[PDB]
């Protein structure tokens, strides 16, 4: 017997809340699944619909149903409405609204110019692709009037991919499943982090380089501390908003560029007091600058 | 054959309340009717019957047709508490039910404090096109409000409603792919006197102080009171930081922060160009340096 | 910022067809922002049609019917409203507006660039 063709259809109306120490991302939308039966004969002969709680008595009276399982779901996902459709000539359409967190591989060392890929993976739970086999999967998302109110940039039309995953833990031809795999890719809206926190950065560790102008060994190892202080002060203001993440950034690392610049300066400017009076090396006012920029540029390389 | 089943809607909207900016959410707690008229049936003493809660379940069983209307832009299942049917002799259904969800809307807090948002609702049949069912007419009634003083936003105008087709491209499997939708909306702005008082007030005494460098006397004095004054910006984004909602943009806050950095590192270069290029006259730039900040303001 | 013009309609015997067509210019990098209006004299400016929030979805007012549809060139930044089984009532000048903000695509407030109109007349 040939497996039944189950064609499905994906609506997406929203991804949001992530989380980016778990990886995860929530999903509101509606799936469709169609696959044809056999004939049946329903009241005047016309399509029949059955909602919610009333599913369930077809079910118990023979009406094969199979359960689809989205693979990287995180806990079960929140079912509202659901509906059958049964048509005479066999055809069946079931029809849920769901809000699950999905999870998947998410990369935040470019943060804030890090780029996603939102992903939902279907699969049937127990029927493998000589029962079940999904025919073909097509998706639609939101049309966006304008994204600049908006966290995440979508770019480009959804993914799509129907493939089979084969289990070595269930032993003949039936340890293979069909699985669809939707895409959506987004990049992130960097505009505040670019604004309210990348462009005061640079200007606080490049306020820090203002010691050099200094005309006393005292002024300029004194004010170094208090640039130290403003680096640290900066560092819980990035540390209460940027997200949690287990490795470092890109304005992380220039954090710890500003920790390593201001301390350089405390051994150059302790230095320059005990070589030889060297205000030749304290106008290291141009090396400082331009030492920082050079490893800045290497920092980003990735 | 059969024309569509008229259904009148009601909502009574208690509270909209816990606004999540970034998410683009906010909470509706309220009561939902949906009237229609049915087959005339026999009820007990020929007065409206009442079914509530796990009990309405056994009637659908028995045939009676409760069409699922669904929150169109609700954030998953909604909180669906006490839900009643009457039913009337003369075939009048009258469903009634207390709900509480999370919506979702477009919303711009680019003006924050002083945004404006319109909070919508839209109901929908969730299995039955126009053909088999439409919306007749729709009413909205709110809370009245004694004082608006205590309430993060102040609502304006009555609230609006629309009654819509929507049609589906993917529903071409005679001419039933056709849904009526129901669409509420209330008009509010936010009331911004808190982030006036302890926000933006406080914020602006903190970038005036630091133009008081170009009075003090000795260079070494000015560029020191810079880094305090760098170091009070500093402690302030934070503080608010910690409070104003998480957006995806600057705000009017922000972009202030912001000014309080750049006047502050301005300020750290002239001090700096007028001493190697002792020029106290420069310094007198008192009057200049606050000025071309508000000039630049404007734009 | 856009300016956006009408065209394509004109008079038609009662059950006749026209099919409107509104262009626009300048800064605009979606045509889901924009949508169709109409006002006759006596009446206060009413929403016909414009896209829907999901994809393949379209928002129409009541008293279409299914009569108009709302199709897009997104390449030549234009929308076209193909108007069939026309009656007298439709009567009117249909506005192209383009949504500014808000977000309730129904309500003409958030909508502005309004365009000269096209004047669209059903006889019996």
């Known amino acids: 017997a040939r497996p039944v063709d189950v064609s499905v259809s994906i609506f997406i109306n929203k991804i949001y809340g992530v989380n980016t120490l778990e990886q995860t991302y929530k999903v509101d939308g509606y799936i469709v699944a169609q696959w044809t039966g056999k004939p049946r004969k329903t009241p005047g002969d016309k399509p029949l619909i059955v909602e919610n709680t009333q599913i369930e008595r077809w079910i118990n009276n023979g009406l094969w149903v199979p359960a689809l399982e989205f693979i990287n779901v995180v806990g079960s996902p929140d079912t509202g409405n659901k509906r059958l459709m049964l048509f005479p000539d066999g055809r069946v359409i079931y029809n849920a609204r769901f809000l699950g967190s999905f999870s998947n591989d998410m990369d935040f060392r470019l943060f804030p110019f890090d780029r996603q890929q939102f992903v939902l993976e279907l699969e049937p739970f127990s029927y493998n692709n000589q029962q079940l086999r999904f025919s073909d999967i097509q998706v639609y998302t939101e049309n966006i009037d304008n994204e600049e109110i908006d966290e995440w940039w979508i770019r480009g039309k959804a993914s799509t991919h129907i493939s089979d995953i084969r289990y070595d833990h269930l032993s003949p031809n039936q340890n293979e499943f069909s699985r669809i795999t939707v895409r959506i890719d987004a990049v992130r809206n960097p505009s505040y982090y670019l604004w309210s926190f990348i462009l005061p950065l640079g200007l606080i560790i490049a306020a820090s380089w203002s010691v050099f102008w200094l005309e006393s060994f005292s002024e300029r190892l004194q004010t170094s501390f208090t640039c130290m202080l403003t680096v640290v002060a900066y560092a819980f203001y990035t540390s209460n908003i940027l997200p949690r993440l287990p490795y470092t950034t890109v304005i992380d690392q220039m954090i710890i560029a500003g920790y390593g610049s201001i301390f350089a300066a405390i051994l150059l400017i302790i230095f320059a007091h005990h070589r030889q009076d060297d205000l030749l090396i304290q106008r290291s006012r141009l090396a400082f600058p331009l030492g920082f920029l050079a490893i800045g540029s290497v920092l980003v390389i990735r | 054959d059969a024309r569509p089943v008229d259904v009148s809607v009601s909502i009574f909207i208690n509270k909209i309340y816990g606004v999540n900016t970034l998410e683009q959410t906010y909470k509706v707690d309220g009561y939902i009717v949906a009237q229609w008229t049915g087959k005339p049936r026999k009820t007990p003493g020929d007065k409206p019957l009442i079914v509530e809660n796990t009990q309405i379940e056994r009637w659908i069983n028995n045939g009676l047709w409760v069409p699922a209307l669904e929150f169109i832009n609700v954030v998953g299942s909604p909180d669906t508490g006490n839900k009643r049917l009457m039913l009337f002799p003369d075939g009048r259904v009258i469903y009634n039910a207390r709900f509480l969800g999370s919506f979702s809307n477009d919303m711009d807090f680019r003006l924050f404090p002083f945004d404006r948002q319109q909070f919508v609702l839209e109901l929908e049949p969730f299995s039955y096109n126009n053909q088999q069912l439409r919306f007749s007419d729709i009413q909205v009634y709110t809370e009245n409000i004694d004082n608006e003083e205590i309430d993060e936003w102040w609502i304006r105008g009555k609230a609006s409603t629309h009654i819509s087709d929507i049609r589906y491209d993917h529903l071409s499997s005679p001419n039933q792919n056709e849904f009526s939708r129901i669409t509420v909306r209330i008009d509010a702005v936010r009331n911004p006197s808190y982030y006036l008082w302890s926000f933006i007030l406080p914020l602006g005494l903190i970038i005036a102080a630091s133009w008081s460098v170009f009075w003090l006397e000795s260079f070494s004095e000015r560029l020191q009171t810079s880094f305090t004054c760098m170091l009070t910006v500093v402690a302030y984004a934070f503080y608010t930081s910690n409070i104003l909602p998480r957006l995806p943009y600057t705000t009017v806050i922000d972009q202030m922060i912001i000014a309080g950095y750049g006047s502050i590192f301005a300020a750290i270069l002239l001090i700096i160009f007028a001493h190697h290029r002792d020029d106290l006259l420069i310094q007198r730039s008192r009057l200049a340096f606050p000025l071309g900040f508000l000039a630049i303001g404007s734009v | 910022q856009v300016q956006l013009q009408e065209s394509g309609g004109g008079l038609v015997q009662a059950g006749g067809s026209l099919r409107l067509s509104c262009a626009a210019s300048?800064?605009?990098?979606?045509?889901?922002?924009m949508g169709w209006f109409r006002q006759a004299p006596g009446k206060e400016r009413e929403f016909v049609a414009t896209?829907?929030?999901?994809?393949?979805?379209?928002v129409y007012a009541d008293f279409v019917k299914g009569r108009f549809t709302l199709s897009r060139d997104n390449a030549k930044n234009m929308v076209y409203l193909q108007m069939n089984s026309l009656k007298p009532e439709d009567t009117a000048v249909y506005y192209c507006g383009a949504r500014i903000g808000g977000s309730d695509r129904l309500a003409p407030e958030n909508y502005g660039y309004w365009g000269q109109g096209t004047q669209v007349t059903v006889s019996s």
């Open positions: 896209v829907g929030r999901i994809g393949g979805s379209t």
């Open positions: 300048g800064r605009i990098f979606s045509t889901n922002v």
